[PDB]
Amino acid sequence: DFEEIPEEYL
Amino acid sequence: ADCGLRPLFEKKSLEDKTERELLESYI
Amino acid sequence: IVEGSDAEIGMSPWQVMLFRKSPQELLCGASLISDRWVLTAAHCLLYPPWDKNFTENDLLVRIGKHSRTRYERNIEKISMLEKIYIHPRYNWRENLDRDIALMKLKKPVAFSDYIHPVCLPDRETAASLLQAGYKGRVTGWGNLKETKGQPSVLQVVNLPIVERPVCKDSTRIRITDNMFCAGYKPDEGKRGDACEGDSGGPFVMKSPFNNRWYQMGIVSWGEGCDRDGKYGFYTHVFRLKKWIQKVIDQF
Ligand SMILES: COCCC[C@H](NC(=O)c1cccn1C(=O)[C@H](N[C@H](O)N1CCOCC1)C(c1ccccc1)c1ccccc1)B(O)O
C-alpha cells in the first residue's frame, strides 16, 4: 500500500 | 541540546491543540 | 493507535518509521535522539518466536513523515543503518523485559521543521514526571483498532501513567521495574491505546520546568488494544539510560 520510494535508497 | 524543542511549536511559541492536557495533569 | 486523532504537522518531529526494504512495509515506530542515533524497541528487530531477526541491510528508517504510505518528497529523509545495538539483557523469551535498541545511521540526518531530536530524561525529570495520573503522549502509524484498519497519517493520543499495582493486576505477564503502563480505566470514560505497528515509537512528556519534550517510554506490548481493564506497556527509558549512554559513548 506504500508508494514507491526512490530506488536509490534501495 | 536543542533537544525537545519543536521548530513549529516551542521554537515559535505556538502550542499544539492538546499539549495543555498534559500540563493540566502535572500536579 | 486506537482512539487517537491525526497529528498536527511537525507535532512529533522526532518520530521515525522503521521500514522494511522488501516487501516495502512499516515494521515499527522509533525516535530520533541525535543526528545519527535512533531509539526503538528491541522486539522490532529481534523476536525469535516470530522468526524475526533483522540485519542492518534489511531496513530503512524514514524521518520527518506524516503520511503513512505516501513518499513525502522534500519533507521526509530516508536513512540507511550503519549498525544495530540491542540491549544485552533484552528478554524476548518471557516478558520483553528491557525492550530497547539503538540504531546508528550511515550518515547524519539534517534537522528541519519536521525533523528534530527529543530529549532523554535525567533522573530528576523522570522522578518528577513518571507518576500515576501524569499524562504522556504516544504517536504511531499502527492499527486504529483491534479487529478503520490503518491510518492515513500519524496518529496521536494522550494517556495517563497508571499505578504500578493496577498495571500488575491487569495482566498475567511478569511486570518489571523496566516497564510502566499507561491508559485510562473503565470508570474514567476517556479511551485510547497503542496498537500493532506502534511498537518502538515514543511515549513523551513535556516538562513544565523547562518546556522541553522528553521520551519517557517506548511502546512495547499490550493485550489487545484499548480493551477495558487492560493497559499498554512501555519500556522505561530512564531506567535503561546507562546502557544507552554507554553505546553512544563507546560507538
Ligand atoms: C498496547 O498494545 C501495543 C502492541 C504493540 C506491538 N507489540 C507487540 O505485539 C508485542 C511484541 C511480541 C508479542 N507482543 C505483545 O504485545 C503480546 N500481545 C499478544 O500478542 N496479544 C494479547 C494476547 O492475545 C494474542 C495477542 C503480549 C501478550 C500479553 C498477554 C498475553 C499474550 C501476549 C506479550 C508481552 C510480553 C511478551 C510476549 C507477549 B508492536 O510490535 O507494534
User: In chain B, what are the domains?
Assistant: 1-27 (4.10.140.10)
Q: What is the resolution of this structure in A?
A: 1.9
Q: Is C166 on the interface with A (CB under 8 A)?
A: no
CATH 1.10.1060.10 is the classification of domain C13-117+239-249: no
Q: Which atom of ligand 1 is nearest to the CA of C194?
A: 1
The answer to whether C19 and C26 have CB atoms below 8 angstroms apart is: yes
CATH number for the segment(s) C1-12+118-238: 2.40.10.10
CB of C222 closer than 6 angstroms to any ligand 1 atom: yes
Window 116-175 of C: residues touching B by CB (8 A cutoff) are 116-120, 129, 133-137, 156, 158, 160
Can chain A be said to touch chain C, i.e. do they have 3 or more Cβ pairs within 8 angstroms?
yes
Q: Cell 521500514 identifies what position?
A: C19
Per CB-CB distance under 8 Å, the chain B contacts of C114 are 7-8
CB of C232 closer than 6 angstroms to any ligand 1 atom: yes
Residue of B nearest to C112 (CA): B7
Q: How far is CA C169 from CA C79, C164, C181, C203, in A?
A: 41, 9, 11, 22
Across the interface, of C135, C136, C213, the residue whose CB is closest to B4 is C213
Q: Which atom of ligand 1 is nearest to the CA of C44?
A: 41
Residues of C that are catalytic: 43, 99, 199
Task: List, edge to edge, every strand of the sheet that includes C232-236.
Answer: C5-6, C155-160, C135-140, C202-206, C213-221, C232-236, C179-182
The answer to whether C160 and B24 have CB atoms below 8 angstroms apart is: no
Distance between CA atoms of residues C137 and B25, nearest Å: 12
What does chain B come to in residues? 27
Across the interface, of B7, B17, B23, the residue whose CB is closest to C8 is B17
CATH 2.40.10.10 in chain C, residue ranges: 1-12+118-238, 13-117+239-249
Shortest CA gap C160–chain B (Å): 8
